[PDB]
Amino acid sequence: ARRLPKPTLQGRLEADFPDSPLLPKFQELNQNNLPNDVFREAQRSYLVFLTSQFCYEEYVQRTFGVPRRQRAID
Amino acid sequence: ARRLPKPTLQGRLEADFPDSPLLPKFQELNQNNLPNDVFREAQRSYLVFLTSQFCYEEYVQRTFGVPRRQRAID
Amino acid sequence: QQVNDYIKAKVGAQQATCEI
Amino acid sequence: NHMNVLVIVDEFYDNKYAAPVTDIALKCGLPTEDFLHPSNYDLLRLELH
């Protein structure tokens, strides 16, 4: 019927950091009259889902990227 | 009947390194009505036999005398 | 019934009898 | 019939249903104070020497 108290989690983190990638993948948030703060929590959950996906992809690339024989000729 | 399963062994060593002296003494193996997978495993086994042979010669040629009498002048 | 057969195996199936 | 140990091992465990323990292990399992008991007469009467 309910959940935990929400943590602190302060600030609009995406707006202070436009330099990072994956923000064009973030802007697809339609609002069918959702209130002004549960939309922010939805955006935060979508952002942490995106940064976990980006971190998992970069870890997959860092694990398939082992020292090869081709790169050691330098 | 069967053997152990084959281990991973990623890559092809003769694809990357043409600079060892073992390359022309490898190329004489050719398939004759043989699928290329077992033929490739034959290449791998011949390559590992040749590098074991070469490091064996490298050992026995540096260990006839690891010291020598002739080096006293220089 | 197989457990019963195991039990009847692992124990027995004047002499001064005694209950417990 | 052939000299290769791995397929000898794999031909013994191929989803084995019944795993009969040897009688020698059944002898050495139990201690002495029930080895003399008449419940273990099936092990006792083949212990002769």
PDB file of C-alpha atoms in Angstrom:
ATOM      1  CA  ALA A   1       0.000   0.000   0.000  1.00  0.00           C
ATOM      2  CA  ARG A   2       3.046   2.262   0.395  1.00  0.00           C
ATOM      3  CA  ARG A   3       6.838   2.353   0.206  1.00  0.00           C
ATOM      4  CA  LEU A   4       9.895   3.735   1.971  1.00  0.00           C
ATOM      5  CA  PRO A   5      10.567   7.367   2.733  1.00  0.00           C
ATOM      6  CA  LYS A   6      12.436   8.813  -0.196  1.00  0.00           C
ATOM      7  CA  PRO A   7      16.115   9.762   0.250  1.00  0.00           C
ATOM      8  CA  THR A   8      17.597  13.245  -0.068  1.00  0.00           C
ATOM      9  CA  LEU A   9      18.886  13.093  -3.694  1.00  0.00           C
ATOM     10  CA  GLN A  10      19.210  16.837  -4.142  1.00  0.00           C
ATOM     11  CA  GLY A  11      19.481  18.919  -7.282  1.00  0.00           C
ATOM     12  CA  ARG A  12      18.683  18.767 -10.975  1.00  0.00           C
ATOM     13  CA  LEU A  13      21.805  16.811 -11.876  1.00  0.00           C
ATOM     14  CA  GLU A  14      21.262  16.702 -15.636  1.00  0.00           C
ATOM     15  CA  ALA A  15      20.891  20.469 -16.034  1.00  0.00           C
ATOM     16  CA  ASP A  16      24.096  21.382 -14.212  1.00  0.00           C
ATOM     17  CA  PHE A  17      25.946  18.835 -16.373  1.00  0.00           C
ATOM     18  CA  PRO A  18      25.106  19.277 -20.061  1.00  0.00           C
ATOM     19  CA  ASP A  19      28.633  18.137 -20.995  1.00  0.00           C
ATOM     20  CA  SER A  20      27.926  14.437 -20.505  1.00  0.00           C
ATOM     21  CA  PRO A  21      26.516  12.224 -23.294  1.00  0.00           C
ATOM     22  CA  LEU A  22      23.171  10.316 -23.295  1.00  0.00           C
ATOM     23  CA  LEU A  23      21.122  13.426 -22.535  1.00  0.00           C
ATOM     24  CA  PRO A  24      19.595  13.281 -26.076  1.00  0.00           C
ATOM     25  CA  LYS A  25      18.391   9.862 -24.958  1.00  0.00           C
ATOM     26  CA  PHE A  26      16.995  11.512 -21.834  1.00  0.00           C
ATOM     27  CA  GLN A  27      14.789  14.189 -23.406  1.00  0.00           C
ATOM     28  CA  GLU A  28      12.055  11.730 -24.494  1.00  0.00           C
ATOM     29  CA  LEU A  29       9.878  12.256 -21.427  1.00  0.00           C
ATOM     30  CA  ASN A  30       6.266  12.967 -22.297  1.00  0.00           C
ATOM     31  CA  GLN A  31       4.083  14.444 -19.552  1.00  0.00           C
ATOM     32  CA  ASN A  32       0.387  13.571 -19.683  1.00  0.00           C
ATOM     33  CA  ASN A  33      -0.337  16.042 -16.846  1.00  0.00           C
ATOM     34  CA  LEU A  34       1.954  14.395 -14.362  1.00  0.00           C
ATOM     35  CA  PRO A  35       2.728  16.720 -11.413  1.00  0.00           C
ATOM     36  CA  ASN A  36       5.929  18.705 -11.176  1.00  0.00           C
ATOM     37  CA  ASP A  37       7.819  16.391  -8.780  1.00  0.00           C
ATOM     38  CA  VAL A  38       6.830  12.793  -9.585  1.00  0.00           C
ATOM     39  CA  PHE A  39       7.946  13.703 -13.104  1.00  0.00           C
ATOM     40  CA  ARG A  40      11.314  14.671 -11.589  1.00  0.00           C
ATOM     41  CA  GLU A  41      11.513  11.320  -9.808  1.00  0.00           C
ATOM     42  CA  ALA A  42      10.607   9.566 -13.058  1.00  0.00           C
ATOM     43  CA  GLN A  43      13.369  11.541 -14.789  1.00  0.00           C
ATOM     44  CA  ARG A  44      15.835  10.609 -12.047  1.00  0.00           C
ATOM     45  CA  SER A  45      14.956   6.926 -12.302  1.00  0.00           C
ATOM     46  CA  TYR A  46      15.282   7.093 -16.076  1.00  0.00           C
ATOM     47  CA  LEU A  47      18.635   8.846 -15.651  1.00  0.00           C
ATOM     48  CA  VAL A  48      20.046   6.276 -13.261  1.00  0.00           C
ATOM     49  CA  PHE A  49      18.757   3.528 -15.551  1.00  0.00           C
ATOM     50  CA  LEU A  50      20.552   5.208 -18.451  1.00  0.00           C
ATOM     51  CA  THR A  51      23.804   5.687 -16.557  1.00  0.00           C
ATOM     52  CA  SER A  52      23.717   2.080 -15.386  1.00  0.00           C
ATOM     53  CA  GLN A  53      23.160   0.989 -18.985  1.00  0.00           C
ATOM     54  CA  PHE A  54      26.008   3.211 -20.171  1.00  0.00           C
ATOM     55  CA  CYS A  55      28.271   1.930 -17.401  1.00  0.00           C
ATOM     56  CA  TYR A  56      27.377  -1.680 -18.188  1.00  0.00           C
ATOM     57  CA  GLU A  57      28.079  -1.104 -21.880  1.00  0.00           C
ATOM     58  CA  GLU A  58      31.417   0.564 -21.139  1.00  0.00           C
ATOM     59  CA  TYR A  59      32.283  -2.299 -18.802  1.00  0.00           C
ATOM     60  CA  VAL A  60      31.373  -4.832 -21.500  1.00  0.00           C
ATOM     61  CA  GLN A  61      33.664  -2.960 -23.884  1.00  0.00           C
ATOM     62  CA  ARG A  62      36.386  -2.825 -21.214  1.00  0.00           C
ATOM     63  CA  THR A  63      36.149  -6.586 -20.637  1.00  0.00           C
ATOM     64  CA  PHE A  64      36.079  -7.603 -24.291  1.00  0.00           C
ATOM     65  CA  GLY A  65      38.915  -5.133 -24.648  1.00  0.00           C
ATOM     66  CA  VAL A  66      41.818  -7.195 -23.359  1.00  0.00           C
ATOM     67  CA  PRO A  67      45.392  -6.674 -24.637  1.00  0.00           C
ATOM     68  CA  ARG A  68      45.303  -8.184 -28.110  1.00  0.00           C
ATOM     69  CA  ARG A  69      48.257  -9.362 -30.136  1.00  0.00           C
ATOM     70  CA  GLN A  70      47.490  -6.701 -32.759  1.00  0.00           C
ATOM     71  CA  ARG A  71      47.880  -3.710 -30.440  1.00  0.00           C
ATOM     72  CA  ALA A  72      51.138  -4.920 -28.868  1.00  0.00           C
ATOM     73  CA  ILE A  73      53.243  -4.437 -32.024  1.00  0.00           C
ATOM     74  CA  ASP A  74      53.943  -0.744 -31.191  1.00  0.00           C
TER      75      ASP A  74
ATOM     76  CA  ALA B   1      37.152 -42.553 -27.919  1.00  0.00           C
ATOM     77  CA  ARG B   2      36.783 -38.844 -27.116  1.00  0.00           C
ATOM     78  CA  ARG B   3      39.192 -36.392 -25.527  1.00  0.00           C
ATOM     79  CA  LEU B   4      38.943 -33.442 -23.204  1.00  0.00           C
ATOM     80  CA  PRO B   5      37.113 -30.440 -24.652  1.00  0.00           C
ATOM     81  CA  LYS B   6      39.356 -27.902 -26.308  1.00  0.00           C
ATOM     82  CA  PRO B   7      40.353 -24.846 -24.253  1.00  0.00           C
ATOM     83  CA  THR B   8      39.695 -21.253 -25.355  1.00  0.00           C
ATOM     84  CA  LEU B   9      42.920 -20.106 -27.078  1.00  0.00           C
ATOM     85  CA  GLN B  10      41.691 -16.914 -28.709  1.00  0.00           C
ATOM     86  CA  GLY B  11      43.282 -15.547 -31.859  1.00  0.00           C
ATOM     87  CA  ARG B  12      45.619 -16.891 -34.512  1.00  0.00           C
ATOM     88  CA  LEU B  13      49.313 -16.423 -33.775  1.00  0.00           C
ATOM     89  CA  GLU B  14      50.470 -16.672 -37.391  1.00  0.00           C
ATOM     90  CA  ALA B  15      47.857 -14.065 -38.310  1.00  0.00           C
ATOM     91  CA  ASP B  16      49.570 -11.433 -36.182  1.00  0.00           C
ATOM     92  CA  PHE B  17      53.296 -12.268 -35.940  1.00  0.00           C
ATOM     93  CA  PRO B  18      55.217 -12.829 -39.193  1.00  0.00           C
ATOM     94  CA  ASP B  19      58.504 -11.801 -37.567  1.00  0.00           C
ATOM     95  CA  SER B  20      59.487 -14.978 -35.767  1.00  0.00           C
ATOM     96  CA  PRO B  21      61.763 -17.319 -37.774  1.00  0.00           C
ATOM     97  CA  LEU B  22      59.155 -20.095 -37.387  1.00  0.00           C
ATOM     98  CA  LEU B  23      56.933 -18.852 -40.218  1.00  0.00           C
ATOM     99  CA  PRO B  24      58.330 -20.591 -43.373  1.00  0.00           C
ATOM    100  CA  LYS B  25      58.765 -23.852 -41.442  1.00  0.00           C
ATOM    101  CA  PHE B  26      55.025 -23.778 -40.689  1.00  0.00           C
ATOM    102  CA  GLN B  27      53.452 -23.194 -44.106  1.00  0.00           C
ATOM    103  CA  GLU B  28      54.141 -26.686 -45.489  1.00  0.00           C
ATOM    104  CA  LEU B  29      51.053 -28.141 -43.812  1.00  0.00           C
ATOM    105  CA  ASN B  30      48.097 -28.249 -46.204  1.00  0.00           C
ATOM    106  CA  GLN B  31      44.732 -29.975 -46.018  1.00  0.00           C
ATOM    107  CA  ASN B  32      43.911 -32.945 -48.260  1.00  0.00           C
ATOM    108  CA  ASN B  33      40.167 -33.760 -48.069  1.00  0.00           C
ATOM    109  CA  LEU B  34      40.124 -32.291 -44.573  1.00  0.00           C
ATOM    110  CA  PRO B  35      37.657 -29.796 -43.064  1.00  0.00           C
ATOM    111  CA  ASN B  36      39.324 -26.547 -42.089  1.00  0.00           C
ATOM    112  CA  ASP B  37      38.545 -26.748 -38.364  1.00  0.00           C
ATOM    113  CA  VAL B  38      40.527 -29.931 -37.645  1.00  0.00           C
ATOM    114  CA  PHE B  39      43.081 -28.732 -40.201  1.00  0.00           C
ATOM    115  CA  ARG B  40      43.368 -25.522 -38.176  1.00  0.00           C
ATOM    116  CA  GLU B  41      43.805 -27.518 -34.983  1.00  0.00           C
ATOM    117  CA  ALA B  42      46.558 -29.402 -36.790  1.00  0.00           C
ATOM    118  CA  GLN B  43      48.183 -26.044 -37.611  1.00  0.00           C
ATOM    119  CA  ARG B  44      47.883 -25.001 -33.964  1.00  0.00           C
ATOM    120  CA  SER B  45      49.477 -28.227 -32.746  1.00  0.00           C
ATOM    121  CA  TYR B  46      52.278 -27.963 -35.290  1.00  0.00           C
ATOM    122  CA  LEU B  47      52.895 -24.355 -34.273  1.00  0.00           C
ATOM    123  CA  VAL B  48      53.100 -25.223 -30.597  1.00  0.00           C
ATOM    124  CA  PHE B  49      55.394 -28.153 -31.429  1.00  0.00           C
ATOM    125  CA  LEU B  50      57.649 -25.791 -33.375  1.00  0.00           C
ATOM    126  CA  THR B  51      57.826 -23.156 -30.658  1.00  0.00           C
ATOM    127  CA  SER B  52      58.572 -25.833 -28.066  1.00  0.00           C
ATOM    128  CA  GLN B  53      61.276 -27.151 -30.416  1.00  0.00           C
ATOM    129  CA  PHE B  54      62.728 -23.671 -30.888  1.00  0.00           C
ATOM    130  CA  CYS B  55      62.754 -22.776 -27.203  1.00  0.00           C
ATOM    131  CA  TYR B  56      64.304 -26.191 -26.512  1.00  0.00           C
ATOM    132  CA  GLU B  57      67.139 -25.397 -28.919  1.00  0.00           C
ATOM    133  CA  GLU B  58      67.384 -21.928 -27.373  1.00  0.00           C
ATOM    134  CA  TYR B  59      67.838 -23.548 -23.981  1.00  0.00           C
ATOM    135  CA  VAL B  60      70.416 -26.154 -25.010  1.00  0.00           C
ATOM    136  CA  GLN B  61      72.454 -23.643 -27.025  1.00  0.00           C
ATOM    137  CA  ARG B  62      72.762 -21.151 -24.171  1.00  0.00           C
ATOM    138  CA  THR B  63      73.531 -23.881 -21.617  1.00  0.00           C
ATOM    139  CA  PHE B  64      76.458 -25.732 -23.176  1.00  0.00           C
ATOM    140  CA  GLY B  65      78.547 -23.247 -21.300  1.00  0.00           C
ATOM    141  CA  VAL B  66      76.708 -20.393 -19.619  1.00  0.00           C
ATOM    142  CA  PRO B  67      80.191 -19.300 -18.532  1.00  0.00           C
ATOM    143  CA  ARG B  68      83.039 -19.734 -21.012  1.00  0.00           C
ATOM    144  CA  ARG B  69      86.820 -19.630 -20.791  1.00  0.00           C
ATOM    145  CA  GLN B  70      87.194 -17.375 -23.851  1.00  0.00           C
ATOM    146  CA  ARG B  71      85.523 -14.270 -22.377  1.00  0.00           C
ATOM    147  CA  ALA B  72      88.412 -13.432 -20.024  1.00  0.00           C
ATOM    148  CA  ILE B  73      90.116 -11.002 -22.412  1.00  0.00           C
ATOM    149  CA  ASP B  74      87.119  -8.760 -23.172  1.00  0.00           C
TER     150      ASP B  74
ATOM    151  CA  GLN C   1       5.630 -49.437   3.712  1.00  0.00           C
ATOM    152  CA  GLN C   2       9.269 -49.571   2.607  1.00  0.00           C
ATOM    153  CA  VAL C   3      10.194 -47.368   5.563  1.00  0.00           C
ATOM    154  CA  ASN C   4       8.266 -49.847   7.750  1.00  0.00           C
ATOM    155  CA  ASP C   5      10.359 -52.676   6.243  1.00  0.00           C
ATOM    156  CA  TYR C   6      13.534 -50.744   7.066  1.00  0.00           C
ATOM    157  CA  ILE C   7      12.387 -50.276  10.669  1.00  0.00           C
ATOM    158  CA  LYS C   8      11.503 -53.961  11.026  1.00  0.00           C
ATOM    159  CA  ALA C   9      14.955 -54.726   9.662  1.00  0.00           C
ATOM    160  CA  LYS C  10      16.981 -52.573  12.007  1.00  0.00           C
ATOM    161  CA  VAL C  11      15.444 -53.924  15.226  1.00  0.00           C
ATOM    162  CA  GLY C  12      14.059 -57.301  16.248  1.00  0.00           C
ATOM    163  CA  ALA C  13      10.790 -58.481  14.749  1.00  0.00           C
ATOM    164  CA  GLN C  14      11.711 -67.371  31.500  1.00  0.00           C
ATOM    165  CA  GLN C  15      13.213 -64.239  29.976  1.00  0.00           C
ATOM    166  CA  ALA C  16      11.848 -61.540  32.366  1.00  0.00           C
ATOM    167  CA  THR C  17      10.144 -59.170  29.936  1.00  0.00           C
ATOM    168  CA  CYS C  18      10.264 -55.396  30.397  1.00  0.00           C
ATOM    169  CA  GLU C  19       8.416 -52.484  28.852  1.00  0.00           C
ATOM    170  CA  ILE C  20       9.861 -48.989  28.527  1.00  0.00           C
TER     171      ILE C  20
ATOM    172  CA  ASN D   1      38.631 -53.065 -23.752  1.00  0.00           C
ATOM    173  CA  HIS D   2      40.416 -49.813 -24.605  1.00  0.00           C
ATOM    174  CA  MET D   3      43.107 -47.819 -22.854  1.00  0.00           C
ATOM    175  CA  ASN D   4      41.702 -44.327 -22.208  1.00  0.00           C
ATOM    176  CA  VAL D   5      40.656 -43.313 -18.717  1.00  0.00           C
ATOM    177  CA  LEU D   6      38.231 -40.414 -19.253  1.00  0.00           C
ATOM    178  CA  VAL D   7      35.608 -42.378 -21.148  1.00  0.00           C
ATOM    179  CA  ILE D   8      36.073 -45.165 -18.594  1.00  0.00           C
ATOM    180  CA  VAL D   9      35.069 -42.683 -15.883  1.00  0.00           C
ATOM    181  CA  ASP D  10      32.180 -41.218 -17.887  1.00  0.00           C
ATOM    182  CA  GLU D  11      30.760 -44.657 -18.612  1.00  0.00           C
ATOM    183  CA  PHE D  12      30.339 -45.297 -14.881  1.00  0.00           C
ATOM    184  CA  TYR D  13      28.402 -42.200 -13.773  1.00  0.00           C
ATOM    185  CA  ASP D  14      25.979 -41.666 -16.701  1.00  0.00           C
ATOM    186  CA  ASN D  15      23.022 -40.665 -14.503  1.00  0.00           C
ATOM    187  CA  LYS D  16      23.418 -43.659 -12.218  1.00  0.00           C
ATOM    188  CA  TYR D  17      20.202 -44.522 -10.402  1.00  0.00           C
ATOM    189  CA  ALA D  18      21.356 -47.310  -8.097  1.00  0.00           C
ATOM    190  CA  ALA D  19      24.689 -46.853  -6.302  1.00  0.00           C
ATOM    191  CA  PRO D  20      25.306 -50.064  -4.348  1.00  0.00           C
ATOM    192  CA  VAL D  21      27.809 -49.649  -1.540  1.00  0.00           C
ATOM    193  CA  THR D  22      30.281 -52.469  -1.085  1.00  0.00           C
ATOM    194  CA  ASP D  23      29.771 -54.720   1.912  1.00  0.00           C
ATOM    195  CA  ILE D  24      33.283 -53.951   3.256  1.00  0.00           C
ATOM    196  CA  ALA D  25      32.256 -50.301   3.711  1.00  0.00           C
ATOM    197  CA  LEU D  26      29.097 -51.470   5.459  1.00  0.00           C
ATOM    198  CA  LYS D  27      31.308 -53.477   7.807  1.00  0.00           C
ATOM    199  CA  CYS D  28      33.628 -50.622   8.641  1.00  0.00           C
ATOM    200  CA  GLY D  29      30.834 -48.089   9.052  1.00  0.00           C
ATOM    201  CA  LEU D  30      29.214 -49.271  12.261  1.00  0.00           C
ATOM    202  CA  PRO D  31      31.201 -49.539  15.513  1.00  0.00           C
ATOM    203  CA  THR D  32      31.633 -52.629  17.653  1.00  0.00           C
ATOM    204  CA  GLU D  33      28.715 -52.326  20.061  1.00  0.00           C
ATOM    205  CA  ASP D  34      26.139 -53.065  17.377  1.00  0.00           C
ATOM    206  CA  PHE D  35      28.304 -55.189  15.093  1.00  0.00           C
ATOM    207  CA  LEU D  36      27.728 -57.959  17.625  1.00  0.00           C
ATOM    208  CA  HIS D  37      24.018 -57.162  17.626  1.00  0.00           C
ATOM    209  CA  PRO D  38      21.726 -59.687  15.893  1.00  0.00           C
ATOM    210  CA  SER D  39      20.328 -56.962  13.626  1.00  0.00           C
ATOM    211  CA  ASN D  40      23.576 -57.158  11.654  1.00  0.00           C
ATOM    212  CA  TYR D  41      23.400 -60.916  11.276  1.00  0.00           C
ATOM    213  CA  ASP D  42      23.431 -60.430   7.505  1.00  0.00           C
ATOM    214  CA  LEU D  43      26.915 -58.964   7.845  1.00  0.00           C
ATOM    215  CA  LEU D  44      28.041 -61.233  10.672  1.00  0.00           C
ATOM    216  CA  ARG D  45      27.412 -64.628   9.066  1.00  0.00           C
ATOM    217  CA  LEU D  46      29.848 -63.807   6.261  1.00  0.00           C
ATOM    218  CA  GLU D  47      32.590 -62.836   8.729  1.00  0.00           C
ATOM    219  CA  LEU D  48      34.336 -66.125   9.420  1.00  0.00           C
ATOM    220  CA  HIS D  49      38.064 -65.594   9.631  1.00  0.00           C
TER     221      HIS D  49
END
